[PDB]
Structure formats: C-alpha cells, structure tokens
Amino acid sequence: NDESILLLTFLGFTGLVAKYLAPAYKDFADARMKKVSDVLNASRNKHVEAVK
Amino acid sequence: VSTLIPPKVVSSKNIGSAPNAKRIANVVHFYKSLPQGPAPAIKANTRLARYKAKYFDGDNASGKPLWHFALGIIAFGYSMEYYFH
C-alpha cells in the first residue's frame, strides 16, 4: 500500500509527542495547578488572620 | 464640670471596623462548604465518566484517548471510501 508509508511516519510523530511533549505538558499543567492551589491557600490564611 | 467619656460612647464605631465586612461574608462562605468533602464526583459512572476518570481527569494527562481516537479514524475512512463516495 502507498499510504501505509504515511501511517509509519504518523506513528513516529505520535511517538515523538509521547516522548517529549506528554512529560513537558505534564510539567506545564503541574506548575499552573500548584499556582491555583497556592493562591487559594493564601486567601484561606488571610481571612483566618483577620478573625484573630 | 464636664465629665464626658469617649470609650463607652464608642459602640457605634465598634460595628464600624472593616474586617466585619469580611467576617459576615466568610461565616456565610463557610456556612455550608465541605472541608474537602468525602469523595464527591471525581469518579462517576456514566460509562464514559469512567473513561474520563482514567484519561481526562487532572489525575491523568495521558495521551491514550488521543491515540485511541486517532486509531479509530485510521480504521474508519479506509473501509468507508468504498461504502460512500
């Protein structure tokens, strides 16, 4: 088949993506999640102070 | 001669403090919020909510559904060319 060569290249592309991008995108996502949580916990602290 | 007393005649400024605004807010903000809940809805059964739980949660950013959907389309169009067009 002609198009089976194209499917081999597509498999190589998805392999490169799972190699490089899926850990990078994990790290990117992680960084942001932390930031949201940290803001949240900061506000929690903030109001506890005010009561005291 | 004038024995006037400011401290106990301050009693209308003792509602006046600014964190009172925050206080009455956050007794209402915390009148019903679960502390963290028990185990709310992270997993559910819609029979594709299970699919979501393994792949499309914050628990997993795994590339597997993408792979699955890609492989589906590869299977789809080759048979379908001869059936439609």
Of the candidates B60, B7, B84, which has an alpha carbon nearest to the alpha carbon of residue A22? B60
Sequence letter at residue A26: K
Contact A29 B61 (CB under 8 A): yes
The set of residues, in sequence order, having a beta carbon less than 8 Å from that of A7 and lying 6+ positions away, is B74
Of the candidates B27, B11, B31, which has an alpha carbon nearest to the alpha carbon of residue B19? B27
d(CA A25, CA A8): 24
The set of residues, in sequence order, having a beta carbon less than 8 Å from that of B62 and lying 6+ positions away, is A22, B54, B55
Tell me the shortest Cα–Cα distance from A12 to chain B, in angstroms: 12
d(CA A50, CA B25): 12
Burial of B81 (0-12, 13-18, 19+ CB in 10 A): exposed
The set of residues, in sequence order, having a beta carbon less than 8 Å from that of B49 and lying 6+ positions away, is B43
Scan for tokens 């809805």, then name that residue. B41
Q: Are B43 and B53 in contact (CB under 8 A)?
A: yes
Q: Which residues of chain A have a Cβ shorter than 8 Å from any chain B Cβ?
A: 7, 14, 17-18, 22, 25-26, 29, 33, 47, 50-51
Q: What is the resolution of this structure in A?
A: 4.8
The set of residues, in sequence order, having a beta carbon less than 8 Å from that of B22 and lying 6+ positions away, is A47, A50
* Chain B residues within 8 A of A47 when measuring between CB atoms: 22, 26
